[PDB]
Amino acid sequence: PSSSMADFRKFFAKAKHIVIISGAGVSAESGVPTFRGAGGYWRKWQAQDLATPLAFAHNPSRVWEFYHYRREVMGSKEPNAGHRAIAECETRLGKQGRRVVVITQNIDELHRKAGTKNLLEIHGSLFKTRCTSCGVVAENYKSPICPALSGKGAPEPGTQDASIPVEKLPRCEEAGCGGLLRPHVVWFGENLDPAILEEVDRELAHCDLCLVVGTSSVVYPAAMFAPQVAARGVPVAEFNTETTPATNRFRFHFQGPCGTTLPEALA
């Protein structure tokens, strides 16, 4: 896979429909905890322990404490130069009649905070709820999401469960519902929204350039998307921190923090 920025820029200059697949590394460069992989814990758990239907079924208070903490942490986090290069790209190309779409597994909305409008959040958002009774999905930026969670979700080991009764967890505010809300986030063992997948497929079918940023093209989620693109002969450029180009079959690989490489690549 080629390391030539100048060669990439030649493709970039001509591209009318860029797909940008954004993985966990873009959020990690902003200091966002992911609670996955080595060392990444909340209390004694990782996401695989808490982001599951069974965990929510058995201990919804503990799961809401976890998501409350992650919501509140975002008050001290900012998009990085990679988010900004991506948003600025969308804005500049959009005035030229050229499309940029960001397909992200990140749930922290830093792409939105950076100014990205064309965003497919395949794992949902920390700042959306879904009613487990009526199914309504709502934006929710309230700090705290409900009064009982104020000061809860502390991440330190040894912190006891808040054990909030379900009636005092976040409830649906649709007239005549009152159901228990969950985060509008894909959990382990759960299906992706098929409508989002349909939209993803449309973008991949039409794009003439694909970036994979902050993740590898041979693991989920990029492995679900990049092969479709490469099969049509569309260049795929990878921007990640692996010194190993874990792939060939993809045209480009640029090693380093996305905040270092993308401002140059997308200028």
């Binding site: 695989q48 069974l54 965990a55 794992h123 382990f188 063992g189 759960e190 989920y220 989620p221």
Partner: peptide, 4 residues
């Protein structure tokens, strides 16, 4: 518990 691991599977997305």
């Amino acid at each position: 518990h691991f599977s997305k």
